[PDB]
Amino acid sequence: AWKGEVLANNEAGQVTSIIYNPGDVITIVAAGWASYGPTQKWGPQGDREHPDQGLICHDAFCGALVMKIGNSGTIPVNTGLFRWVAPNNVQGAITLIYNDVPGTYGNNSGSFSVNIGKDQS
Amino acid sequence: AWKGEVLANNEAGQVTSIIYNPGDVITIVAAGWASYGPTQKWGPQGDREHPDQGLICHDAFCGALVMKIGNSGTIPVNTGLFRWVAPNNVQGAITLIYNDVPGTYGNNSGSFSVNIGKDQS
Amino acid sequence: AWKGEVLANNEAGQVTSIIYNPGDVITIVAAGWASYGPTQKWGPQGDREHPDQGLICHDAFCGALVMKIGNSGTIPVNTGLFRWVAPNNVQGAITLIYNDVPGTYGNNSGSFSVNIGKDQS
Amino acid sequence: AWKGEVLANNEAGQVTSIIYNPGDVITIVAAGWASYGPTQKWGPQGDREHPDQGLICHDAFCGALVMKIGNSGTIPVNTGLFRWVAPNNVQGAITLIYNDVPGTYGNNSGSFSVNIGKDQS
């Protein structure tokens, strides 16, 4: 497995050591508190009242945990994925990233605590 | 494995199909939006700015997902648990409950979508 | 998980540390060589030639690996079970037993090595 | 997971849908009854008395289940493998084969029924 944290102020995210391979089934659980600027904080689902101003992942809220698998596009994680299989032609290293607008991460705060593991398949 | 809805306005909480037995490893993932009152909603982590006024679980925030296993006291689930094991002498049916004050549930809204699986042991 | 030996000469069988509970998925791998008398040895499938002169388990061959879960009747194991769910309402510690006629086990030699683990469910 | 048959009378052996990847843990269970010629049938451990007259796998008996993983040599499976990891740098598609002398597979009858799954990491 992989266990670690994902800094909200870190625009490259965390490249993990989970290589997602065709047919792999994975589980992710994410927890904690983060902000894209305000003194208030939101968890891994992000802020459902905030509008999308050019976020790296449009299918999730600002301040939400999202991921890339290899050189795929962003994919929402939020609180987690349970026994999840990826779509066709998606494979490689799982990278985790705070969902925010490129260029704006400098005042972010907090982090998410995240566990990833491969399940039986 | 079990998947189902935990309604925030359900004071007795949602009984699952999971009997937790000694030695079991389980993984929970919970997602969704709920309110204990206001028009604003919060996820399974609850509202970190709201006071504890007699919550059924003092170890989580108001509006957090929690649970009981058989006769146990409430245990925080929040966003979930990864490859988790119960304390010795904790066993029985998992009930999943919105963390709120007893007798205040009638105004509550929305729900959490929750996965529970047992993992390899 | 559990790993140990099942002696061919033991009528009482070997109690393991696996408690089978309802809904449990289990895997068993059995290996090795044993005899109920003759100078030849057979593996954990037993002897396909030989008649059932009063075997503790009538649905496996003589010399095959079998099991009880709790105080159940015998259940065939043979070379192993792969992500197997009990068809019944059956619960308790798995005991492993070499299938043979009671009283005759004095002729027997050898043993199987056996692994059991609970899979994800 | 994959479930299928390896024909004893098939020299090329059966290619599976399982692609072994770095860090994969796999479980295999094999069962059934096959001969390499004689009228007696032996299970996936094979015949422990029959001598080795030029076998594709020298580390299992004639009549035993063995396998290649991509470009590796033959590796013994026999009755199975429990939460098993592959040797340094072994990867690719898993093929299951009846261990025998390359040229003689026409003599054979019967088959092994086989399940392969990946386990948790």
Short mmCIF file of C-alpha atoms in Angstrom, two decimals:
data_model
loop_
_atom_site.label_atom_id
_atom_site.label_comp_id
_atom_site.label_asym_id
_atom_site.label_seq_id
_atom_site.Cartn_x
_atom_site.Cartn_y
_atom_site.Cartn_z
CA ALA A 1 0.00 0.00 0.00
CA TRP A 2 0.73 3.75 0.15
CA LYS A 3 0.04 6.04 3.11
CA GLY A 4 0.83 9.77 3.12
CA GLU A 5 -0.41 13.33 3.08
CA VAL A 6 -1.36 15.68 0.20
CA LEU A 7 -0.53 19.35 0.81
CA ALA A 8 -3.21 21.78 -0.38
CA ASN A 9 -0.47 24.36 -1.30
CA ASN A 10 1.36 21.83 -3.55
CA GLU A 11 0.44 22.31 -7.13
CA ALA A 12 2.23 19.17 -8.44
CA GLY A 13 0.46 16.89 -5.92
CA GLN A 14 2.05 13.70 -4.59
CA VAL A 15 3.28 11.05 -7.00
CA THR A 16 2.57 7.80 -5.12
CA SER A 17 4.12 4.38 -5.52
CA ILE A 18 0.87 2.77 -6.60
CA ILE A 19 1.21 1.78 -10.21
CA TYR A 20 -2.34 1.28 -11.46
CA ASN A 21 -2.37 -1.59 -14.02
CA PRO A 22 -5.16 -2.90 -16.33
CA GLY A 23 -7.71 -4.82 -14.27
CA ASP A 24 -6.41 -3.55 -10.91
CA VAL A 25 -9.02 -2.84 -8.24
CA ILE A 26 -8.10 -0.11 -5.77
CA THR A 27 -9.45 1.47 -2.61
CA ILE A 28 -8.69 5.00 -1.44
CA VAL A 29 -9.77 6.64 1.78
CA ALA A 30 -9.00 10.34 2.36
CA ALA A 31 -9.48 12.49 5.41
CA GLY A 32 -8.63 15.94 6.80
CA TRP A 33 -8.94 19.67 6.43
CA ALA A 34 -7.80 22.16 3.81
CA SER A 35 -8.42 25.60 2.28
CA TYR A 36 -7.85 27.21 -1.15
CA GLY A 37 -7.48 30.66 0.53
CA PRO A 38 -10.09 31.35 3.24
CA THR A 39 -9.58 30.81 6.95
CA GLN A 40 -12.47 28.25 6.89
CA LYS A 41 -11.45 24.68 5.88
CA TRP A 42 -13.18 21.89 3.90
CA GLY A 43 -12.59 18.18 3.75
CA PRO A 44 -11.78 16.00 0.75
CA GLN A 45 -15.14 16.74 -1.01
CA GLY A 46 -14.16 20.38 -1.11
CA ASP A 47 -16.49 23.38 -1.03
CA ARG A 48 -19.85 22.74 -2.72
CA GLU A 49 -20.70 26.50 -2.66
CA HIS A 50 -17.55 27.56 -4.56
CA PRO A 51 -17.73 28.06 -8.35
CA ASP A 52 -15.28 26.45 -10.75
CA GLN A 53 -12.88 29.22 -11.98
CA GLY A 54 -10.73 26.93 -14.21
CA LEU A 55 -10.03 24.00 -11.83
CA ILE A 56 -7.71 21.11 -12.83
CA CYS A 57 -10.76 18.84 -12.19
CA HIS A 58 -14.14 20.18 -13.31
CA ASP A 59 -15.97 17.09 -12.10
CA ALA A 60 -15.15 17.99 -8.49
CA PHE A 61 -15.41 20.92 -6.16
CA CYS A 62 -12.68 23.35 -5.42
CA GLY A 63 -10.72 22.03 -2.49
CA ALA A 64 -11.53 18.39 -3.32
CA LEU A 65 -8.99 15.57 -3.62
CA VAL A 66 -8.53 14.41 -7.21
CA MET A 67 -6.02 12.22 -9.02
CA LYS A 68 -4.18 11.42 -12.20
CA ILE A 69 -3.20 7.90 -13.27
CA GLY A 70 -0.15 8.10 -15.47
CA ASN A 71 -0.72 10.97 -17.93
CA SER A 72 -4.54 10.73 -17.77
CA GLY A 73 -6.79 13.67 -17.07
CA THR A 74 -7.97 14.48 -13.60
CA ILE A 75 -10.27 12.04 -11.83
CA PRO A 76 -12.27 12.82 -8.66
CA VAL A 77 -11.40 11.00 -5.46
CA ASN A 78 -13.16 13.20 -2.85
CA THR A 79 -13.50 11.12 0.34
CA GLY A 80 -12.31 8.01 -1.49
CA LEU A 81 -12.88 5.24 -4.04
CA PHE A 82 -14.14 1.77 -2.92
CA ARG A 83 -12.97 -1.31 -4.98
CA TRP A 84 -12.60 0.87 -8.05
CA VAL A 85 -11.55 -0.11 -11.59
CA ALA A 86 -10.33 2.56 -14.09
CA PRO A 87 -11.63 3.09 -17.65
CA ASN A 88 -10.07 1.81 -20.88
CA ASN A 89 -6.49 2.85 -21.73
CA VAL A 90 -5.82 4.31 -18.27
CA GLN A 91 -2.73 3.09 -16.43
CA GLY A 92 0.38 4.23 -14.57
CA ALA A 93 1.44 5.93 -11.35
CA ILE A 94 -1.30 7.42 -9.19
CA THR A 95 -0.74 11.09 -8.46
CA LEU A 96 -2.90 12.90 -5.88
CA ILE A 97 -3.61 16.63 -6.11
CA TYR A 98 -5.70 19.23 -4.27
CA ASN A 99 -8.31 20.45 -6.80
CA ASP A 100 -7.70 24.16 -7.43
CA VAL A 101 -7.00 26.67 -10.23
CA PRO A 102 -3.48 26.58 -11.66
CA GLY A 103 -1.37 29.52 -10.40
CA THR A 104 -3.41 30.03 -7.22
CA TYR A 105 -2.08 27.38 -4.84
CA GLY A 106 0.41 29.65 -3.02
CA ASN A 107 -1.94 30.65 -0.15
CA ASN A 108 -3.56 27.20 0.27
CA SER A 109 -3.34 25.54 3.66
CA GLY A 110 -3.79 22.19 5.33
CA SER A 111 -3.65 18.74 3.90
CA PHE A 112 -5.47 15.45 3.41
CA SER A 113 -4.40 12.19 4.98
CA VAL A 114 -4.81 9.44 2.31
CA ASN A 115 -4.49 5.64 2.22
CA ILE A 116 -4.41 3.71 -1.08
CA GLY A 117 -4.24 0.00 -1.56
CA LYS A 118 -4.85 -2.61 -4.22
CA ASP A 119 -7.68 -5.05 -3.62
CA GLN A 120 -8.21 -8.60 -4.83
CA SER A 121 -9.10 -8.77 -8.45
CA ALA B 1 -19.88 -6.14 0.96
CA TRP B 2 -22.60 -3.61 1.74
CA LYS B 3 -23.71 -0.34 0.09
CA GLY B 4 -26.65 1.79 1.17
CA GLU B 5 -27.87 5.24 2.28
CA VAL B 6 -27.61 6.72 5.78
CA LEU B 7 -30.33 9.37 6.17
CA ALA B 8 -29.36 12.29 8.41
CA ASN B 9 -32.92 12.44 9.89
CA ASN B 10 -32.69 8.78 11.08
CA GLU B 11 -32.03 8.80 14.82
CA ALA B 12 -31.76 5.00 15.22
CA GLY B 13 -29.42 4.97 12.19
CA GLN B 14 -29.01 2.50 9.32
CA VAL B 15 -28.40 -1.16 10.17
CA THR B 16 -26.10 -2.78 7.59
CA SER B 17 -25.68 -6.40 6.34
CA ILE B 18 -22.28 -6.51 8.05
CA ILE B 19 -21.72 -8.55 11.15
CA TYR B 20 -18.28 -7.61 12.48
CA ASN B 21 -16.49 -10.72 13.86
CA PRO B 22 -13.25 -11.08 15.91
CA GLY B 23 -10.26 -10.83 13.54
CA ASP B 24 -12.25 -9.06 10.73
CA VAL B 25 -10.51 -6.26 8.76
CA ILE B 26 -12.99 -3.82 7.24
CA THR B 27 -12.85 -0.83 4.94
CA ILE B 28 -15.47 1.86 4.91
CA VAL B 29 -15.83 4.74 2.45
CA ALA B 30 -18.56 7.38 2.91
CA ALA B 31 -19.55 10.22 0.59
CA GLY B 32 -22.40 12.78 0.40
CA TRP B 33 -23.87 15.96 1.90
CA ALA B 34 -26.11 16.41 4.95
CA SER B 35 -27.36 19.05 7.39
CA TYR B 36 -28.34 18.93 11.05
CA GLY B 37 -30.46 22.02 10.53
CA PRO B 38 -29.09 24.91 8.40
CA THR B 39 -29.50 25.15 4.61
CA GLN B 40 -25.73 24.53 4.29
CA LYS B 41 -24.62 20.86 4.07
CA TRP B 42 -21.45 19.11 5.29
CA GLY B 43 -19.87 15.82 4.45
CA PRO B 44 -19.21 12.74 6.56
CA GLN B 45 -16.54 14.74 8.52
CA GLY B 46 -19.26 17.00 9.88
CA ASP B 47 -19.05 20.65 10.88
CA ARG B 48 -15.77 21.47 12.66
CA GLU B 49 -17.14 24.90 13.80
CA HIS B 50 -20.27 23.55 15.58
CA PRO B 51 -20.32 22.96 19.36
CA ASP B 52 -20.84 19.57 21.02
CA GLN B 53 -24.24 20.03 22.80
CA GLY B 54 -24.73 16.34 23.73
CA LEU B 55 -23.79 14.42 20.55
CA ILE B 56 -24.17 10.61 20.60
CA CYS B 57 -20.44 10.56 19.70
CA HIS B 58 -18.23 13.15 21.41
CA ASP B 59 -15.17 11.89 19.41
CA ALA B 60 -16.52 13.28 16.10
CA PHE B 61 -18.08 16.56 14.93
CA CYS B 62 -21.79 17.25 14.73
CA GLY B 63 -22.92 15.94 11.37
CA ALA B 64 -20.13 13.37 11.06
CA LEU B 65 -20.80 9.72 10.11
CA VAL B 66 -20.34 7.38 13.04
CA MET B 67 -21.30 3.86 13.89
CA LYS B 68 -21.97 1.22 16.50
CA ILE B 69 -20.94 -2.43 16.36
CA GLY B 70 -23.40 -4.55 18.35
CA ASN B 71 -23.49 -3.25 21.92
CA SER B 72 -20.52 -0.90 21.53
CA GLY B 73 -20.40 2.84 22.16
CA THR B 74 -20.30 5.05 19.04
CA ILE B 75 -17.10 4.93 16.94
CA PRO B 76 -16.13 7.74 14.53
CA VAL B 77 -16.15 6.73 10.83
CA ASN B 78 -16.06 10.18 9.21
CA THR B 79 -14.83 9.67 5.63
CA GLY B 80 -14.09 6.02 6.27
CA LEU B 81 -11.60 3.57 7.64
CA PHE B 82 -8.83 1.75 5.85
CA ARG B 83 -8.03 -1.89 6.68
CA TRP B 84 -9.39 -1.35 10.19
CA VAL B 85 -9.75 -3.74 13.16
CA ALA B 86 -12.05 -3.30 16.18
CA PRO B 87 -10.79 -3.14 19.79
CA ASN B 88 -10.91 -6.59 21.57
CA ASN B 89 -14.53 -7.57 22.57
CA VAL B 90 -16.32 -5.45 19.94
CA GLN B 91 -18.62 -7.46 17.70
CA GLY B 92 -22.04 -7.61 16.05
CA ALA B 93 -24.05 -5.78 13.43
CA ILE B 94 -22.68 -2.44 12.23
CA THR B 95 -25.16 0.42 12.50
CA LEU B 96 -24.16 3.68 10.79
CA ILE B 97 -25.51 6.87 12.33
CA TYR B 98 -25.46 10.62 11.68
CA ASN B 99 -23.75 12.27 14.61
CA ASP B 100 -26.27 14.60 16.26
CA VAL B 101 -27.92 15.36 19.63
CA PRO B 102 -30.69 12.82 20.66
CA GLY B 103 -34.16 14.28 19.92
CA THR B 104 -32.97 16.88 17.37
CA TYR B 105 -33.07 14.80 14.21
CA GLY B 106 -36.46 15.93 12.78
CA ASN B 107 -35.05 18.95 11.00
CA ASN B 108 -32.01 17.04 9.50
CA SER B 109 -31.60 16.67 5.71
CA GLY B 110 -29.70 14.71 3.06
CA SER B 111 -27.65 11.55 3.47
CA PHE B 112 -24.31 9.82 3.13
CA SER B 113 -23.63 7.04 0.56
CA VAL B 114 -21.56 4.39 2.43
CA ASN B 115 -19.53 1.38 1.26
CA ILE B 116 -18.37 -1.31 3.74
CA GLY B 117 -16.33 -4.34 2.72
CA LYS B 118 -14.35 -6.87 4.73
CA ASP B 119 -10.77 -7.12 3.59
CA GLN B 120 -8.23 -9.92 3.40
CA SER B 121 -6.99 -11.46 6.66
CA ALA C 1 -4.14 -16.46 7.89
CA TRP C 2 -3.17 -20.00 9.04
CA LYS C 3 -0.51 -22.50 7.91
CA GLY C 4 0.21 -25.98 9.30
CA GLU C 5 0.12 -29.76 8.87
CA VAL C 6 -2.63 -32.35 8.72
CA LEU C 7 -1.33 -35.79 9.59
CA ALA C 8 -2.76 -38.75 7.73
CA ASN C 9 -2.66 -40.85 10.89
CA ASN C 10 -4.80 -38.38 12.99
CA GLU C 11 -8.46 -39.30 13.41
CA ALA C 12 -9.11 -36.18 15.46
CA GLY C 13 -7.81 -33.90 12.71
CA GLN C 14 -6.04 -30.58 13.14
CA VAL C 15 -7.86 -27.56 14.64
CA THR C 16 -6.86 -24.30 12.96
CA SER C 17 -7.18 -20.67 14.15
CA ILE C 18 -9.68 -19.83 11.37
CA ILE C 19 -13.23 -19.30 12.60
CA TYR C 20 -15.53 -19.50 9.58
CA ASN C 21 -18.36 -16.96 9.94
CA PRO C 22 -21.45 -16.50 7.69
CA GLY C 23 -20.60 -14.51 4.57
CA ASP C 24 -16.89 -15.33 4.89
CA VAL C 25 -15.02 -16.04 1.67
CA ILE C 26 -11.98 -18.32 2.23
CA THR C 27 -9.13 -19.78 0.27
CA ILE C 28 -7.30 -23.05 1.04
CA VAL C 29 -4.26 -24.48 -0.70
CA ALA C 30 -3.30 -28.04 0.22
CA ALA C 31 -0.20 -29.86 -0.79
CA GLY C 32 1.78 -33.05 -0.22
CA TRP C 33 1.74 -36.84 -0.11
CA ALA C 34 0.07 -39.41 2.16
CA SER C 35 -1.19 -43.01 2.36
CA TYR C 36 -4.04 -44.96 3.95
CA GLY C 37 -2.06 -48.21 3.84
CA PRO C 38 -0.49 -49.10 0.44
CA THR C 39 3.15 -48.37 -0.34
CA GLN C 40 2.17 -45.75 -3.00
CA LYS C 41 1.37 -42.18 -1.84
CA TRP C 42 -1.43 -39.84 -3.05
CA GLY C 43 -1.96 -36.09 -2.75
CA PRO C 44 -4.83 -34.24 -1.11
CA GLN C 45 -7.37 -35.34 -3.80
CA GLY C 46 -7.07 -38.90 -2.49
CA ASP C 47 -7.37 -42.15 -4.43
CA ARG C 48 -9.92 -42.12 -7.27
CA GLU C 49 -9.78 -46.01 -7.56
CA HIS C 50 -10.76 -46.91 -3.95
CA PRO C 51 -14.27 -47.74 -2.64
CA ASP C 52 -15.80 -45.90 0.32
CA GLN C 53 -15.72 -48.64 3.01
CA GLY C 54 -17.15 -46.16 5.62
CA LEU C 55 -15.38 -42.82 5.04
CA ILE C 56 -16.01 -39.90 7.39
CA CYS C 57 -16.71 -38.01 4.14
CA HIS C 58 -18.60 -39.86 1.43
CA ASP C 59 -18.27 -37.06 -1.22
CA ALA C 60 -14.46 -37.19 -1.36
CA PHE C 61 -12.05 -39.99 -2.00
CA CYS C 62 -10.09 -41.95 0.53
CA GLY C 63 -6.90 -40.05 1.32
CA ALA C 64 -8.38 -36.67 0.47
CA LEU C 65 -8.24 -33.61 2.64
CA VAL C 66 -11.61 -32.71 4.21
CA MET C 67 -12.81 -30.30 6.82
CA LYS C 68 -15.36 -29.50 9.46
CA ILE C 69 -16.50 -26.02 10.24
CA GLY C 70 -17.54 -26.06 13.86
CA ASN C 71 -19.52 -29.26 14.52
CA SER C 72 -20.64 -29.59 10.90
CA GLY C 73 -20.51 -32.76 8.87
CA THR C 74 -17.40 -33.25 6.76
CA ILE C 75 -16.87 -30.99 3.70
CA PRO C 76 -14.52 -31.86 0.83
CA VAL C 77 -11.36 -29.74 0.50
CA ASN C 78 -9.26 -31.84 -1.92
CA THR C 79 -6.42 -29.62 -3.41
CA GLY C 80 -8.10 -26.48 -2.13
CA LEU C 81 -10.96 -23.98 -2.11
CA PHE C 82 -10.78 -20.71 -4.10
CA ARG C 83 -12.75 -17.78 -2.73
CA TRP C 84 -15.37 -20.19 -1.49
CA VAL C 85 -18.53 -19.34 0.42
CA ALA C 86 -20.24 -22.01 2.46
CA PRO C 87 -23.54 -23.00 0.88
CA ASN C 88 -24.97 -23.49 4.41
CA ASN C 89 -25.65 -21.76 7.71
CA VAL C 90 -22.40 -23.11 9.14
CA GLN C 91 -20.04 -21.44 11.63
CA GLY C 92 -17.04 -22.24 13.81
CA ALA C 93 -13.39 -23.16 13.79
CA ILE C 94 -12.17 -25.01 10.72
CA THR C 95 -10.79 -28.46 11.53
CA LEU C 96 -8.78 -30.30 8.81
CA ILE C 97 -9.00 -34.13 8.52
CA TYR C 98 -7.62 -36.87 6.29
CA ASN C 99 -10.56 -38.73 4.84
CA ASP C 100 -10.50 -42.34 5.93
CA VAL C 101 -12.56 -45.00 7.75
CA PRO C 102 -12.55 -44.65 11.60
CA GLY C 103 -10.32 -47.32 13.27
CA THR C 104 -8.11 -47.85 10.19
CA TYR C 105 -5.84 -44.82 10.55
CA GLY C 106 -3.06 -46.97 12.05
CA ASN C 107 -1.95 -47.94 8.51
CA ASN C 108 -1.55 -44.31 7.42
CA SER C 109 1.55 -42.26 6.87
CA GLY C 110 2.52 -38.83 5.55
CA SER C 111 0.84 -35.44 5.67
CA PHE C 112 -0.38 -32.34 3.82
CA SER C 113 0.84 -28.78 4.26
CA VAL C 114 -2.12 -26.40 4.19
CA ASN C 115 -2.70 -22.67 3.96
CA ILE C 116 -5.99 -20.94 4.80
CA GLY C 117 -6.79 -17.28 4.55
CA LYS C 118 -9.93 -15.20 4.60
CA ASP C 119 -10.42 -13.27 1.38
CA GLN C 120 -12.20 -10.04 0.91
CA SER C 121 -15.99 -10.16 1.07
CA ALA D 1 -9.64 -13.36 -11.73
CA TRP D 2 -9.45 -16.22 -14.27
CA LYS D 3 -11.13 -19.70 -14.22
CA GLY D 4 -10.51 -22.26 -16.97
CA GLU D 5 -9.00 -25.59 -18.05
CA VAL D 6 -5.55 -26.81 -19.00
CA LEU D 7 -5.94 -29.77 -21.37
CA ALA D 8 -3.44 -32.50 -20.52
CA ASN D 9 -3.27 -33.38 -24.26
CA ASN D 10 -2.34 -29.76 -25.29
CA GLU D 11 1.43 -29.10 -25.54
CA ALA D 12 1.12 -25.31 -25.91
CA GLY D 13 -0.75 -25.07 -22.58
CA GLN D 14 -3.52 -22.55 -21.85
CA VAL D 15 -2.81 -18.74 -21.93
CA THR D 16 -4.79 -16.91 -19.17
CA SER D 17 -6.27 -13.40 -18.92
CA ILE D 18 -3.89 -12.77 -15.98
CA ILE D 19 -0.92 -10.51 -16.69
CA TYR D 20 1.49 -10.72 -13.75
CA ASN D 21 2.77 -7.17 -12.87
CA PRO D 22 5.54 -6.05 -10.40
CA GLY D 23 4.38 -6.30 -6.77
CA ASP D 24 1.36 -8.45 -7.68
CA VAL D 25 0.51 -11.13 -5.08
CA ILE D 26 -1.44 -14.06 -6.74
CA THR D 27 -3.27 -17.15 -5.56
CA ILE D 28 -3.78 -20.27 -7.63
CA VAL D 29 -5.92 -23.29 -6.95
CA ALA D 30 -5.72 -26.29 -9.28
CA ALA D 31 -7.85 -29.47 -9.20
CA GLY D 32 -8.73 -32.46 -11.40
CA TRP D 33 -7.38 -35.64 -12.88
CA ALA D 34 -5.12 -36.12 -15.87
CA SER D 35 -2.85 -38.87 -17.24
CA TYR D 36 0.34 -38.71 -19.29
CA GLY D 37 -0.43 -42.18 -20.78
CA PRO D 38 -1.26 -44.90 -18.26
CA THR D 39 -4.83 -45.72 -17.39
CA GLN D 40 -4.41 -44.29 -13.85
CA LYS D 41 -5.08 -40.54 -13.52
CA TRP D 42 -2.98 -38.18 -11.29
CA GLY D 43 -3.83 -34.76 -9.89
CA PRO D 44 -1.89 -31.50 -10.41
CA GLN D 45 1.00 -32.57 -8.17
CA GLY D 46 1.48 -35.34 -10.71
CA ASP D 47 3.16 -38.75 -10.37
CA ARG D 48 5.99 -38.75 -7.83
CA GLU D 49 7.42 -42.14 -8.87
CA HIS D 50 7.54 -41.47 -12.65
CA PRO D 51 11.12 -40.55 -13.65
CA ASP D 52 12.12 -37.32 -15.47
CA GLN D 53 12.65 -38.22 -19.17
CA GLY D 54 13.08 -34.60 -20.51
CA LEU D 55 10.43 -32.42 -18.76
CA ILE D 56 9.77 -28.71 -19.56
CA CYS D 57 9.90 -28.31 -15.77
CA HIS D 58 12.52 -30.29 -13.92
CA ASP D 59 11.23 -29.03 -10.50
CA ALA D 60 7.90 -30.82 -10.65
CA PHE D 61 6.84 -34.32 -11.53
CA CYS D 62 5.51 -35.53 -14.89
CA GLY D 63 1.80 -34.76 -14.81
CA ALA D 64 2.08 -31.72 -12.56
CA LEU D 65 0.69 -28.26 -13.22
CA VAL D 66 3.45 -25.74 -13.91
CA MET D 67 3.39 -22.26 -15.60
CA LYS D 68 5.32 -19.57 -17.50
CA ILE D 69 4.98 -15.90 -16.64
CA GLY D 70 5.77 -13.95 -19.77
CA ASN D 71 9.33 -14.90 -20.62
CA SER D 72 10.28 -16.83 -17.55
CA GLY D 73 11.12 -20.49 -17.45
CA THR D 74 8.63 -23.02 -16.18
CA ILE D 75 7.66 -22.51 -12.52
CA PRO D 76 5.83 -25.20 -10.50
CA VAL D 77 2.26 -24.64 -9.46
CA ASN D 78 1.14 -28.14 -8.55
CA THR D 79 -2.03 -27.87 -6.48
CA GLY D 80 -1.55 -24.15 -6.23
CA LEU D 81 0.22 -21.14 -4.87
CA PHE D 82 -0.99 -19.15 -1.84
CA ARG D 83 -0.38 -15.34 -1.71
CA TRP D 84 2.64 -15.87 -3.92
CA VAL D 85 5.16 -13.34 -5.32
CA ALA D 86 7.21 -13.88 -8.45
CA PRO D 87 11.07 -13.89 -8.66
CA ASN D 88 12.93 -10.64 -9.45
CA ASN D 89 11.91 -9.24 -12.85
CA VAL D 90 9.28 -11.86 -13.77
CA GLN D 91 6.22 -10.37 -15.42
CA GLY D 92 3.75 -10.77 -18.27
CA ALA D 93 1.00 -13.14 -19.30
CA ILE D 94 0.51 -16.35 -17.27
CA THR D 95 0.30 -19.63 -19.26
CA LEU D 96 -0.57 -22.91 -17.48
CA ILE D 97 0.87 -26.21 -18.81
CA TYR D 98 0.76 -29.96 -18.04
CA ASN D 99 4.33 -30.94 -17.23
CA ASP D 100 5.56 -33.49 -19.80
CA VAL D 101 8.24 -34.47 -22.37
CA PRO D 102 7.90 -32.07 -25.37
CA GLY D 103 6.65 -34.38 -28.18
CA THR D 104 4.46 -36.85 -26.19
CA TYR D 105 1.30 -34.84 -25.34
CA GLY D 106 -0.89 -37.00 -27.63
CA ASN D 107 -0.72 -39.82 -25.05
CA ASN D 108 -2.67 -37.71 -22.52
CA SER D 109 -6.20 -37.49 -21.27
CA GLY D 110 -8.16 -35.27 -18.88
CA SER D 111 -7.57 -31.77 -17.56
CA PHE D 112 -6.94 -29.45 -14.60
CA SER D 113 -9.60 -26.94 -13.52
CA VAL D 114 -7.78 -23.78 -12.35
CA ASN D 115 -8.60 -20.42 -10.63
CA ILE D 116 -6.06 -17.51 -10.43
CA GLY D 117 -6.73 -14.27 -8.54
CA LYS D 118 -4.67 -11.28 -7.46
CA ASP D 119 -4.54 -10.57 -3.78
CA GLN D 120 -4.28 -7.32 -1.79
CA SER D 121 -1.13 -5.24 -1.59
#
